[PDB]
Design a protein around this ligand. Structure first.
Ligand SMILES: [Cr+3]
Length: 325
DNA sequence: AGGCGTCG
DNA sequence: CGACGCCT
């Protein structure tokens, strides 16, 4: 890190713009700038120098100036000091609560995790559960806790129907020592693009894992997507395994590749990739890779038979999962 | 970038 | 339906 202090600053200012003023364009600018400055190879000494870079203009250079000269930013020390702002900000940390709900709760005097516990009547189900395991949801999952969870998923999945194929993607398939949650791609030959859909295919697995006391809560659930909570076994012991977040997704059999690409990559990697796709004249999805036609229309999906196959369409050095950060 | 599920 | 929150 050559310019950590400037980046941290722009990222902090970015969150404030998203979570408090809800100014999406500023949020984007600060994010784009931070990312551009972190790749710059020299130590920045003026805002004038920083301004030469793409994505950083006057408002960001002024801030970088003030930061270099004084070791801080007045705008930010005041943001950190404003109680409505920090409260609005902290509540956004609860899964289910975004900028709107945060600004409505604070507007009504609810600011603390404790106040929240005195006001579940204001919270929808997702938010009540997110409030319930707020602390556990903060804890990161060690890769060892992950491998255990994987066996439980794969094993139960076949017991129900051996034709079921489950793959834990996310940061696991990318080679990480710890992950925020468990992301599992699911496929079954009964679910296919040329079939009349199939909701019962995901419910079965979910109810199954629910029965072994694995899946404990449900935030959201549907035909292709499950978002809930899971937990590992303990017999007579204190500090049972913390409750974990688990996302499950049912993709069509004949589209498994676009599915692993999407549920693996990285929110950042996928963004950068779906950007290229458009450049070359294609539309990458979690389902298909249909090409861009006329002035604004994508047609029939190209056939893929590996992730490698998808990249080659937009001409790229196959990015091995562990590189997709 | 692209889209799934919830809310009212 | 739009707006929101969330997924990568
Ligand atoms: Cr994950």
């Amino acid at each position: 890190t050559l310019n950590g202090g400037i980046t941290d600053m722009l990222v902090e200012l970015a969150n404030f713009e998203k979570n408090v003023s809800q100014a999406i364009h500023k949020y984007n600018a600060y994010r784009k700038a931070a990312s551009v400055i972190a790749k710059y190879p020299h130590k920045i000494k003026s805002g004038a120098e920083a301004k030469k870079l793409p994505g950083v203009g006057t408002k960001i250079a002024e801030k970088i100036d003030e930061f270099l000269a004084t070791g801080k930013l007045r705008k930010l020390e005041k943001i950190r000091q404003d109680d409505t702002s920090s409260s609005i900000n902290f509540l956004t940390r609860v899964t289910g609560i975004g900028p709107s709900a945060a600004r409505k709760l604070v507007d009504e005097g609810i600011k603390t995790l404790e106040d929240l516990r005195k006001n579940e009547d204001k919270l929808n189900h997702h938010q009540r559960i997110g409030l319930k395991y707020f602390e556990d949801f903060e804890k990161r999952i060690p890769r060892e806790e992950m491998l255990q969870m994987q066996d439980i998923v794969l094993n139960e999945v076949k017991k129900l129907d051996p034709e079921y194929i489950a793959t834990v993607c996310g940061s696991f398939r990318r080679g990480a020592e710890s992950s925020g949650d468990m992301d599992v791609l699911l496929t079954h030959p009964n679910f296919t693009s040329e079939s009349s859909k199939q909701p019962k295919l995901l419910h079965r697995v979910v109810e199954q894992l629910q029965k072994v006391r694995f899946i404990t809560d449900t935030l959201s659930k549907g035909e292709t997507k499950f978002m809930g909570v899971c937990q590992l076994p303990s017999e007579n012991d204190e500090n049972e395994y913390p409750h974990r977040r688990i996302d499950i997704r049912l993709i069509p059999k004949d589209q498994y590749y676009c599915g692993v690409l999407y549920f693996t990559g990285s929110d950042i990697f996928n963004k950068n990739m779906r950007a290229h796709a458009l450049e070359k004249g294609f539309t990458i999805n979690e389902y298909t890779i249909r090409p861009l036609g006329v002035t604004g229309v994508a047609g029939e999906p190209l056939p893929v038979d590996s992730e490698q196959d998808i990249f080659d369409y937009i001409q790229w050095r196959y990015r091995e999962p562990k590189d997709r950060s």
